Ligand binder design. Structure first.
Ligand SMILES: [Cu+2]
Length: 166
């Protein structure tokens, strides 16, 4: 169990009262748990942000969500792990240049951003990965972070509403 605390995820911002209207998700930012193996297995298209668990997180419009300022260049993503587990990988995706901010999030919406493979070890409770925020684009993009658990069929899904600045 865990969530992305910096840059703050959509559900973490709901937990801190910055996003509103997500119902039960607001109390369990650490529990957006669904099958691993994305972008094959995992949450269904249109239900990725809520992990197939929290449907109010799946709403998508230009104005719906608070956006976190992220400058282009190197970024260290921080996960707060309320229950660290043996880990097989950390995956990051970003919406494609030209994506439609008023449509549901699907596999076809995304492209790969970064993957940090892991050796099965249990990470630190503040788990950090280095990624590169591109400078080929500006403004509102979704970044999907996925924490894949080595010893179960599951993963934790953390969409971030990013404002890429350059
Ligand atoms: Cu857990």
């Amino acid at each position: 169990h865990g969530y992305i605390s910096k840059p703050a995820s959509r559900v973490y911002l709901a937990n801190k009262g910055i996003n509103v209207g997500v119902g039960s998700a607001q109390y369990e930012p650490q529990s957006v748990e669904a099958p691993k193996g994305f972008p094959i297995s995992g949450p269904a298209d249109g239900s990725i942000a809520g992990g197939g668990k929290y449907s109010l997180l799946d709403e998508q419009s230009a104005s719906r969500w608070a956006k976190v300022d992220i400058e282009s260049g190197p970024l260290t993503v921080e996960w707060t792990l309320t229950a660290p587990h043996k880990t097989s990988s950390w995956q990051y995706f970003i919406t494609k240049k030209g994506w439609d901010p008023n449509k549901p999030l699907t596999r076809s919406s995304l492209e790969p951003l970064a993957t940090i493979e892991a050796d099965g070890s249990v990470p630190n409770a503040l788990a950090k990965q280095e990624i590169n925020i591109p400078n080929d684009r500006s403004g509102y993009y979704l970044i999907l972070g996925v924490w894949n658990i080595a010893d179960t069929g599951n993963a934790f899904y953390q969409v971030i509403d990013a404002n890429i600045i350059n």
